[PDB]
């Protein structure tokens, strides 16, 4: 039984009960409200008393088009209409501070099983309760849900109640009446009531008849938590997809498109510089030379929103965030799910489960056929599209006596699909097939976790079992067996995912994907816009993306610090991901002895430290975290450096 | 060798990092607070054209860059068959190209001299 | 490795060639000036096919020669390798480029003063 006393397994589902879970979830939404109340204070452009407000921060930019949509925030250029806005954000920040404090209190006592209220001098029961007095008695026949399946009806009801509350809040406090026309914010109140009716009706149908689907999920907390995470990740991916199409619709122009017209002063952006011999005095600058001379010394300079393209930068920062997470949660749902499939194969409950979500893949025969189809389709697609990108790169670089005429410029999405793209081009045919190939690639590591958590067609051949989920390897036997556990297969899903997770970043930043080299001053790189009649001028090619996008990163003293830090973090993953763990263990031994010897000779007292070294499974953990965190600490710079795609194409240089 | 490699990789890296911080005005620091005054001593000035901090750093980077890859070389010379750790763990390095001994002892990958050659090239 | 194994490779490549050749009509793309609509997909398909064929042959060839190299290849392998660079250098000055470049009249430029002055005129 492999050790589970690690600091990052303290809050595992094994160590918590259903009552503690509720307490844990509540103990965070209260913190989340405290966080949400800080993203509101920071967004005050001018204080209520008249003192100047806070400089633009990315944490408030991604929510500003929403607070403008709800009327809490305004885009007004006048201070009088910008002084009221500040008072409102204070109201909702203080309000979220109060409600957050209640949820933390109702999470601390929930976590400690201490459900006693002083005013009523009576302790409630978690096993059975009326639910908000008479309201629940009429709907749940005076009883509470006894299982996860029976919790669907009551849980659905709660959702209907929350929706109804949001609708009442928009009508009474925000003044948006429910008019059912889908070009105004007033339609978010109308559908807040339609959804509250669907869910309440759906929440009663599931209470009277609890669902029998996935009956085994009731038995284990991690089994249900993982199916929810495989579902929440897909939902989050869908939210990212929907927010990209919607945030740049004509109906969303008053909130997203309006950002272009404003002047933003982000912290860490270029500021008015000064001469080396600068001596600033209160009244005036003396014997000093200061740049611009329009602002005070060391004052952040303005930035034209239109040049920056802030409407698409903010759309990307939100769209990518709910996709970088959506795919992380799909990966974790399979991981924490296969983490539960290891236990049912170890204690042997697998062959007796009648669920077709476990019974369908019982036989190894089908497993190889299912994995052999994901593997064959990934090969026939990651090759068909890579050879197109490589061929397009060769044709435009005039390598091997070829020209941009012989390239895949005539290949584009079919007419049936053309509605999916504003401007159809080979850049769109490639992106669809890259995501298809990028999904089937990281799906291989996921089908492995689902099917080979304990035994594989090869290990059953080699007479071996995978006793744990976090075992690095079985030694150098059979030429080597490293990276065979499902935790390692999770790492190879996160690592392989970085490609499709980058085909999104590139494709939403208006870059070219149909060629490694687009827009460089070479033989046919600048002949794309006219060979294919592109209505837009994409910022750069896959490789030339790094050169162009970084002209704005190097100009910023903070975006460049991220570039440095992000690169420093990423290569350090090589130290713990290379097969040098044995070398590190020896080296440290020399360091402990060396330090002991130095202390001994140098000081009469002898002091030793016994330097520690991480384990492989503990190495592949810190390895993926340093590789993934480093790889997307810098993807932020591509999105936050500006959106530099243009609607004017380039004529051939000739 | 390890002590010299440490006291020199940390002395010169912190100079480069500090110069970078001073030049980008991070933490309200001007290039005036950087090591622009540090350059090779007068005795060595003949080695360089227009001596500067770019020359003081380069000498110490090569010194640190040699002592770093020298660690992987002193280990090939001294631990080809046995090391203080494997004499402790009661193990023999039978071979020059053996990958690891397996997961055992938190794992022991990259212990052969061929792998120590790789960590000298890398 | 006979009969249908090679037929599937050849037939598979051919049927694939029609797909793009048929996809081009479906795409209805505006072709590049002075270039036949039928010709553009055929040219694109041959280059893509050649790239995949080249990668496969290089991998199989290295595998076939990697384990077959013995003491007997002590002279032949080093001589054959000079026979790749040799035929390549000749090809570079015969097929890739004919002569050191000269102007339309036929004059040469080998000095910075000539480049500083020739560009002005």
């Amino acid at each position: 039984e492999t050790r589970s006393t690690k600091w990052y397994q303290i809050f595992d589902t094994e160590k918590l009960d259903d009552e503690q879970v509720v307490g844990g979830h509540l103990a965070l939404l209260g913190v989340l409200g405290f966080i949400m109340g800080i993203y509101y204070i920071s967004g005050i452009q001018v204080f209520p008393w008249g003192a100047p407000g806070f400089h633009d921060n990315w944490f408030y930019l991604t929510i500003k088009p929403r607070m403008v949509s709800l009327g809490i925030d305004t885009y007004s250029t006048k201070t009088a209409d910008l002084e009221a806005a500040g008072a409102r954000l204070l109201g909702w920040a203080a309000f979220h501070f109060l409600v957050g404090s209640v949820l933390i209190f109702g999470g601390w006592r929930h976590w400690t099983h201490n459900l006693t209220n002083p005013f009523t001098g009576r302790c409630g029961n978690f096993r059975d309760f009326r639910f908000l007095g008479k309201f629940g008695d009429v709907v749940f026949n005076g009883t509470s849900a006894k299982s996860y399946k029976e919790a669907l009806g009551p849980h659905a009801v709660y959702m209907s109640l929350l929706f109804l509350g949001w609708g009442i809040v928009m009508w009474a406090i925000l003044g948006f009446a429910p008019i059912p026309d889908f070009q105004t914010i007033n339609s978010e109140t109308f559908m807040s009531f339609v959804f509250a009716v669907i869910f309440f009706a759906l929440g009663i149908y599931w209470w009277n008849n609890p669902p029998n689907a996935a009956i085994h999920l009731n038995d284990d907390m991690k089994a249900a938590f993982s199916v929810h995470l495989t579902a929440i990740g897909y939902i989050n991916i869908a939210l990212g997809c929907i927010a990209f199409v919607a945030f740049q619709q004509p109906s969303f122009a008053p909130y997203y498109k309006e950002l272009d017209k404003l002047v933003f002063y982000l912290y860490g952006e270029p500021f008015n510089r000064v001469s080396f011999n600068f001596v600033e005095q209160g009244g005036k600058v003396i014997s000093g030379a200061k740049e611009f001379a329009d602002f005070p010394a060391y004052a952040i300079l303005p930035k034209s929103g239109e040049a920056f393209g802030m409407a698409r930068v903010v759309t990307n920062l939100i769209v990518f965030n709910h996709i970088i997470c959506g795919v992380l949660y799909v990966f974790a749902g399979v991981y924490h799910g296969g983490q539960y499939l290891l236990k049912i194969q170890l204690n042997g409950m697998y062959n007796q489960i009648k669920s077709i979500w476990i019974t369908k893949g019982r036989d190894q025969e089908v497993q190889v056929k299912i994995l052999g189809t994901v593997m064959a389709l990934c090969f026939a697609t990651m090759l068909s599209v890579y050879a197109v990108i490589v061929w397009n790169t060769i044709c435009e670089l005039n390598i091997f006596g070829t020209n941009i005429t012989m390239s895949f410029y005539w290949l584009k999405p079919l007419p049936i699909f053309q509605w999916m793209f504003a401007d159809p081009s080979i850049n769109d045919w490639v992106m669809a097939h890259v995501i298809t190939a990028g999904s089937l690639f990281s799906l291989i590591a996921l089908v492995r976790i689902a099917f080979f958590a304990h035994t594989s067609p090869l290990w059953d051949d080699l007479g071996l079992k995978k006793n744990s989920y976090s075992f690095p390897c079985l030694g150098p036997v059979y030429g080597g067996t490293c990276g065979v556990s499902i935790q390692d297969q999770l790492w190879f899903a996160m690592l392989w995912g970085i490609k499709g997770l980058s085909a999104v970043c590139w494709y939403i930043d208006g870059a070219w994907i149909a060629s490694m080299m687009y827009g460089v001053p070479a033989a046919d790189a600048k002949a794309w816009d006219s060979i294919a009649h592109l209505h837009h001028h994409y910022t750069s090619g896959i490789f030339y993306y790094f050169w162009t996008e970084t002209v704005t990163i190097f100009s910023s003293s903070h975006l460049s610090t991220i570039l440095m830090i992000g690169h420093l973090v990423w290569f350090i993953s090589f130290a713990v991901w290379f097969e040098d763990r044995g070398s590190r263990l020896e080296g440290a031994d020399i360091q402990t002895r060396t330090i002991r010897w130095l202390g001994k000779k140098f000081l009469n007292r002898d002091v030793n430290f016994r330097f520690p070294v991480l384990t492989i499974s503990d190495s592949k953990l810190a390895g993926t975290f340093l590789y993934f965190g480093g790889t997307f600490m810098l993807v932020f710079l591509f999105l936050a450096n500006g959106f530099y795609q243009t609607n004017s194409p380039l004529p051939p240089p000739v | 060798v390890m002590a010299l490699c440490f006291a020199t990789m940390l002395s010169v890296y912190a100079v480069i990092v500090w110069n970078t911080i001073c030049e980008l005005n991070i933490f309200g620091t001007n290039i005036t607070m950087s090591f622009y005054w540090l350059k090779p001593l007068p005795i060595f000035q003949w080695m360089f054209a227009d001596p500067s901090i770019n020359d003081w750093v380069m000498a110490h980077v090569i010194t640190a860059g040699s002592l770093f890859s020298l660690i992987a070389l002193v280990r090939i010379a001294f631990f080809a068959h046995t090391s203080p750790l494997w004499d402790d763990l009661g193990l023999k390095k039978n071979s020059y190209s053996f990958p690891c001994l397996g997961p055992v002892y938190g794992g022991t990958c990259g212990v052969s001299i061929q792998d120590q050659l790789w960590f000298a090239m890398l | 490795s006979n009969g249908k194994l090679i037929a599937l490779a050849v037939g598979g490549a051919v049927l694939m060639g029609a797909l793009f050749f048929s996809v081009s009509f479906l795409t209805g793309y505006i072709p590049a000036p002075n270039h036949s609509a039928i010709l553009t997909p055929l040219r694109s398909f041959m280059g893509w096919f050649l790239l995949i064929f080249c990668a496969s042959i290089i991998i199989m060839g290295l595998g076939k020669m990697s384990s077959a190299i013995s003491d007997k290849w002590f002279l032949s392998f080093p001589l054959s390798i000079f026979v790749i660079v040799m035929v390549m250098f000749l090809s570079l000055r015969v097929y890739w480029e004919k002569g050191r470049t000269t102007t339309v009249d036929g004059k040469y430029i080998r000095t910075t003063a000539e480049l500083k002055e020739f560009l002005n005129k």
């Binding site: 051949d461 080699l462 150098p476 059979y478 030429g479 080597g480 | 071979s95 053996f98 | 990697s66 384990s67």
Partner: peptide, 20 residues
């Protein structure tokens, strides 16, 4: 087919052998 399959992995092992 296990045996025949193992004769192969054994044909590519971490033990001493002749390499090109």
């Amino acid at each position: 087919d296990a045996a025949k399959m193992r004769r192969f992995l054994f044909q590519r092992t971490e033990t001493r052998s002749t390499k090109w």
